[PDB]
Scaffold this active site. Structure first.
Site, PDB file in Angstrom:
ATOM      1  CG  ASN A  27      -9.223 -96.167 -39.058  1.00  0.00           C
ATOM      2  OD1 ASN A  27      -8.512 -96.010 -39.290  1.00  0.00           O
ATOM      3  ND2 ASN A  27      -9.665 -94.506 -40.106  1.00  0.00           N
TER       4      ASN A  27
ATOM      5  CB  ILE B 130     -14.597-102.117 -38.992  1.00  0.00           C
ATOM      6  CG1 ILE B 130     -14.663-102.257 -37.069  1.00  0.00           C
ATOM      7  CG2 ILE B 130     -13.012-101.767 -39.562  1.00  0.00           C
ATOM      8  CD1 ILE B 130     -14.610-104.043 -37.649  1.00  0.00           C
ATOM      9  CB  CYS B 131     -13.445 -96.660 -41.550  1.00  0.00           C
ATOM     10  SG  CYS B 131     -12.962 -96.038 -43.106  1.00  0.00           S
ATOM     11  CG  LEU B 132     -10.165-102.681 -43.137  1.00  0.00           C
ATOM     12  CD1 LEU B 132      -9.402-102.544 -43.190  1.00  0.00           C
ATOM     13  CD2 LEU B 132     -10.893-104.354 -42.084  1.00  0.00           C
TER      14      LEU B 132
END
Ligand SMILES: Nc1nc2cc(F)ccc2o1
Length: 153
Positions: A79, A86-88
């Site tokens: 991610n 950051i993929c969150l």
């Protein structure tokens, strides 16, 4: 905004005095909205014994827009991309994201720490790593450990 400034003073106080375990966050200089953070590699993760530095930028409309957080230390993860993005969900605005003003810097750094231990192949930023994590976990762990010794130790 005085609202923003008073909120950031309280957050910096809480980050200074009761930081989450493994997490530290501080002012780069004398600006409360130009921050740096550090997350220790969790034990029993491949990032163990690594130290990961992050840049934490607090936008002008905080707390109504989320902190803007990227890894400065390279990290091998489904991610997180090669620029540290950051993929969150809690880092993004609704309806798709989960940011709300009742979260804070410490909350989202803790979420990033949890993402490091529990990746999300649902939402890959790194397709090749995500498939390796999903279908060849021992290769993923070896690559993630090697990237940690190379860049975070
Ligand atoms: N760069 C990027 N961050 C994301 C967060 C999400 F929850 C879903 C997709 C995303 O893409």
């Amino acid at each position: 905004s005085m609202q923003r400034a008073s909120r950031l003073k309280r957050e910096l106080h809480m980050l200074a005095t009761e930081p989450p375990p493994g997490i530290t966050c501080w002012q780069d200089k004398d600006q409360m909205d130009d921050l740096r953070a550090q997350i220790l590699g969790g034990a029993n993760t491949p990032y163990e014994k690594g130290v990961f530095k992050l840049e934490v930028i607090i936008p002008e409309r905080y707390p109504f827009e989320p902190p803007q957080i990227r890894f400065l230390t390279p990290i091998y993860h489904p991610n997180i991309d090669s620029a540290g993005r950051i993929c969150l969900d809690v880092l993004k605005l609704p309806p798709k994201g989960a940011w709300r003003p009742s979260l804070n810097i410490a909350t989202v750094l803790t979420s990033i720490q949890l993402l490091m231990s529990e990746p999300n192949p649902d939402d890959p930023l790194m397709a090749d790593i995500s498939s390796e994590f999903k279908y060849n976990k021992p290769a993923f762990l070896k690559n993630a450990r090697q990237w940690t010794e190379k860049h975070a130790r």
